[PDB]
């Protein structure tokens, strides 16, 4: 019941429900997004100054 506000699909799978693969052939992807989901974190390693 606590999961119901977080639901994302209209029903649970049937018993032995079939799977359809969309990528029938190998192909290059064209990419789409709405902003704020796709991100780069940037960090700096501590390479010391003065030592060596």
């Amino acid at each position: 019941v606590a999961s119901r506000p977080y639901a994302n699909v209209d029903a649970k799978p049937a018993e032995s429900a079939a799977i359809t693969i969309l990528n029938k052939n190998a192909a290059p992807a064209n990419l789409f997004w709405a902003d704020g989901s796709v991100e780069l974190m940037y960090g700096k390693l501590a390479f010391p100054t003065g030592q060596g």
Binding site: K44, L45, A46, F47, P48
Partner: protein
């Protein structure tokens, strides 16, 4: 240090040999501590500070 000798005429007596004894004083092999930090670990300065 000296021998004692007895009597007035000492012509029969060996005089005391002066022995210049010496005491050695020497350094040990130097004593060391080694640690390492990688360039990820060095991002937190407490590691160097507490290990020092």
């Amino acid at each position: 240090h000296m021998n004692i000798e007895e009597g007035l005429d000492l012509s029969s007596k060996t005089p005391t040999a002066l022995v210049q004894r010496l005491v050695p004083s020497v350094f040990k092999e130097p004593k060391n501590i080694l640690y390492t930090l990688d360039a990820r670990e060095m991002r937190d300065p407490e590691h160097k500070t507490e290990a020092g």
